[PDB]
# Entry
Amino acid sequence: KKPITIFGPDFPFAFDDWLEHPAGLGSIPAARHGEEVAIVGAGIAGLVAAYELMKLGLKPVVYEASKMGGRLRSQAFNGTDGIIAELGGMRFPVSSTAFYHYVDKLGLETKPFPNPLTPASRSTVIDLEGQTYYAEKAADLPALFQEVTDAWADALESGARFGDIQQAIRDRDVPRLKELWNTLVPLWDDRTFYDFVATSKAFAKLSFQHREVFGQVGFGTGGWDSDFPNSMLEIFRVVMTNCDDHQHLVVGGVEQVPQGIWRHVPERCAHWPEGTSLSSLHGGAPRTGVKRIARASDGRLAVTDNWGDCRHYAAVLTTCQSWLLTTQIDCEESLFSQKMWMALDRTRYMQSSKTFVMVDRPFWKDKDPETGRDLMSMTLTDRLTRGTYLFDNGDDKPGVICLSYAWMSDALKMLPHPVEKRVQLALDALKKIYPKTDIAGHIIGDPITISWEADPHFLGAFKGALPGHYRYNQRMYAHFMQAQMPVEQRGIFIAGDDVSWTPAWVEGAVQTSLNAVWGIMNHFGGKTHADNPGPGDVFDEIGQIALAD
Amino acid sequence: KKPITIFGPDFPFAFDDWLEHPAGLGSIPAARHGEEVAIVGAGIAGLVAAYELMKLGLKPVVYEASKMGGRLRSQAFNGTDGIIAELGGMRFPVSSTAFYHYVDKLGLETKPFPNPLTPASRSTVIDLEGQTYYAEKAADLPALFQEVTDAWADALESGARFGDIQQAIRDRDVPRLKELWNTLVPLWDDRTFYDFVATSKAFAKLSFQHREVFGQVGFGTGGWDSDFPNSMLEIFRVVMTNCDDHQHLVVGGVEQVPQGIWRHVPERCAHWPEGTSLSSLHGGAPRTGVKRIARASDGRLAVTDNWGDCRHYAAVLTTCQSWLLTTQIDCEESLFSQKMWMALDRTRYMQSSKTFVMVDRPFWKDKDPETGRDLMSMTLTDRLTRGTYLFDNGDDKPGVICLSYAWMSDALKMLPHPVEKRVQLALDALKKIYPKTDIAGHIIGDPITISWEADPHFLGAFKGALPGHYRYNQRMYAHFMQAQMPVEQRGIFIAGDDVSWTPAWVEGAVQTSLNAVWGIMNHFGGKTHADNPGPGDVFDEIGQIALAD
Ligand SMILES: Cc1cc2nc3c(=O)[nH]c(=O)nc-3n(C[C@H](O)[C@H](O)[C@H](O)COP(=O)(O)OP(=O)(O)OC[C@H]3O[C@@H](n4cnc5c(N)ncnc54)[C@H](O)[C@@H]3O)c2cc1C
Ligand SMILES: Cc1cc2nc3c(=O)[nH]c(=O)nc-3n(C[C@H](O)[C@H](O)[C@H](O)COP(=O)(O)OP(=O)(O)OC[C@H]3O[C@@H](n4cnc5c(N)ncnc54)[C@H](O)[C@@H]3O)c2cc1C
Ligand SMILES: NCCC[C@H](N)C(=O)O
Ligand SMILES: NCCC[C@H](N)C(=O)O
Ligand SMILES: NCCC[C@H](N)C(=O)O
Ligand SMILES: NCCC[C@H](N)C(=O)O
# Structure
């Protein structure tokens, strides 16, 4: 059967085909070869754009204020080789075909992520209101859990034509997909996920506790409560494109994706000599953080770095999170329309924390000879840790444990606390769940934590779309299409997962980046090859519907 | 006409009458006079309770981990007398009768708060998408604003029987209020404010922009967007009890409320000698922060402070924000039912930042002879400052300007930034609005800022009730009623504005405190006088409806 992929629904362009086609993404007039384009941010969106623009014969100049990779960050533990904690993105749905294009291009290895109740996880434990349930398959759970699942399946089929939309995605039937999706847009933009859940037939006829347990742990594979306030359109996108199943981790860390793109030598670039990579073009490193972007008096865009160094470019791509164009960069107001500012400024970010330790061995696989149970499981709880994940690196390697992965309120619980207290709070919660398991005794190396909200170069883990934000996201996603733009707004571009329709998913950063590549190519008077048309060649036909004032 | 007051709707008890009645709040058996009751937190809820319990003949022992007054905090500027910035609560609706009972008791002076389009504000400026509107009265504003107001009035009357509910409040017609209110509870618990707005007839027939403007500035008297995700029941409570109009500030700072309660000598206490105040009972200061609460082997509650000192009490009231009973205090898990923990733990906190400067004089009242406009106005914008308030202390005193009062996303935009950058960001935004006004030149003293989310003794400005949180709030509000509780859960109490139905409003802290006074009196075998019945005497009859599982 044809795989589900992140194929629209908003802009069902085949990015994977565009990338794989042997003609390449297009071309730029030879007279513009070697011209510079500024790229703000060295995360996945900045680097994907830089890489493909280099291939088209431009000289991207990437600036990075903090760390290479942005929210793809894999921190090594003390003294180890190949043992990392994924601080940002960690579980990549195989529906992410644009992303996986680069993963494959680098020859990186992936393996199934130990999500609860999957073959990669031996066991799961749910702990709610002081009651603990062990499962090695879904059927092992109390009846309430299958009831929640059935009600969710049914609410999605009844309220979104889930099956029909997924079939259309499988077959890449664009006219059908748009018809279905475009029906849903004005009906669900303005409504929350919780409203979708509460007012569904399947859940309205169940107890409040079914809804509540759905929030805390779902049907035993993951909680939803942090996303309850979001526009249901966001959740539809996630489930319809299977963002929420068949996920892999990148072995050795996903940070190897941005780092590898930086160093990767394409077989063929336009203009550049053999052996050219982004790295070599920069002499090893991106430029420092950007402090200012303004229209210069020669018409170009002036980008000023932290040290006052000012350079001029025909085009500038920004990939930082949207608030940073006010908060961290002095970005001249007339460079975006007031409608674009409102979209960039009203956009909301979700908070997230993760706290990891390393352990001497995957001791959780040991059996409690009294009960038959693993000493420790993938843990979902209403306690402060919320989600605990177990990473097995082989019987003879240390294990890693994400003691707590938390979002929104539960992340904000940890905000002001240092790592020692984070870990202690988590161990004390996990001691309530597993009173007989000595986790502490196995812990080695250093403890690693993060709060994405705290960091001024991110002001959050990822966007979450509120009700009524469809029009904002539509403005942002379409910004790379500039033919109708006032001339004073042209030449600056945006990309990244906040521009995307699917914010907490790396595929959205990749796809928007590729749209910007097309926009920038076009800006330099370039164009796609006639046999491999690109995003902006079809955008007016199959792009996101616009809503009324 | 009889005033609107914060009279239910959930528990329409006449706290004001209770407080004012000459008999007093009740009594406790003489044998228990002088016994201690621990109070965690010296904000308004802890201090009200402590004050009323002292009057009944107990010895409250108040602990405070940080600053007296909690979220009633008035910081004096360098070198000045009587010139303060309100860092927490600042505008107290006159419908807050229990609160104003204590304000009057202390003889404190109040004056109308300079909200937009009131007599206390001379002018207001709205700045949206780069367009600026000046108004000295509502009619000065473009027609869109009156439309938004009409639609909101209409959505409230149509969807909530606002007029009826308000009449029932004016008349303190308890059966009618409850009938009207109880109808709304199951219908709106699970739905957001934005949903109520979008799906109203009045707004559904207006452009998206009408909704949007309503979020950003309302109808020209205040924005609603940070409250859009909350349960609509919360909002109903606000508007029905006039929390959102006729607001006063306390002259010299509202922190004079908690500080004067601490020092106030009642005419008559049971047991204590004349001249007794909370201060004199404590020898001048509350005890330090609490680190632990547990059941002791004598059957009392053990409270352990930061320095390891452990003291035992027949009753403990905690008034810190609910998360802190896991995050900051080791509070023995069996002291609360699991249902209670879940309420305490799931409760969500809103973020808030304010940044104030002092100016040499109220220069904003000067006229621009070219335009006839004030040099500066009460400012509502979509720019990052959001709301700017102007505080006139008289022509011959310095003025105070709250450069930016922001909530949620717009507060999170400032989170990691220091005060200098906060003030500069705000002055730059205000320069875009008022390009001809030199604010900087009038600024003297020190700048003052806060972010309530950042402080570990608060983990936010105040609760905001999410959809589906009615049951949690019902559990917490009712926790002072302990006759059916397991014995192990009795004797600990909670109060404060997160226990209340009206979280960002001081009256809710006062009303819950008073309930807990009742509970604690009852716990010590005391009771109200027959001619002045108290909260728990009528709670089972007029209390908040419970919802089904
Ligand atoms: C906690 C968490 C878990 C996640 N889990 C998943 C997952 O399981 N699966 C999945 O697919 N996706 C996941 N994601 C999302 C994925 O990681 C992102 O969508 C993607 O990494 C974002 O890429 P980006 O290039 O848009 O932005 P970023 O990586 O944010 O890149 C922007 C870069 O801009 C830089 N920058 C900022 N300001 C400046 C300045 N003034 N000058 C120069 N540079 C600047 C930043 O430092 C950063 O490096 C997760 C994200 C988080 C936060
Ligand atoms: C930014 C903001 C604006 C507001 N504006 C308004 C307004 O305009 N009008 C209005 O009516 N209301 C307003 N409020 C609400 C009002 O300020 C609150 O409702 C009220 O002050 C809350 O009082 P409380 O006693 O419940 O809690 P708190 O004031 O939080 O007091 C609890 C105390 O417990 C202490 N504590 C915490 N942990 C411990 C520990 N482990 N041991 C000992 N002590 C501890 C804290 O330090 C704190 O002093 C506002 C609040 C804020 C934050
Ligand atoms: N199970 C009830 C206690 C949960 C605890 N307050 C926590 O957040 O972990
Ligand atoms: N809404 C939960 C966050 C989604 C995130 N991409 C994750 O998979 O963890
Ligand atoms: N409306 C003009 C732009 C606003 C600017 N990004 C700000 O946050 O203030
Ligand atoms: N979040 C809106 C209410 C906040 C507060 N009571 C105020 O008037 O500022």
In short: Chain A has three domains: 1-72+92-112+250-346+470-549, 73-91+347-469, 113-249. Residues 73-91+347-469 of chain A form a domain with the Polyamine Oxidase; Chain A, domain 2 fold (CATH 3.90.660.10). Chain A touches chain B through 53 residues (CB under 8 Å). The two ends of chain A are 41 Å apart (CA to CA).
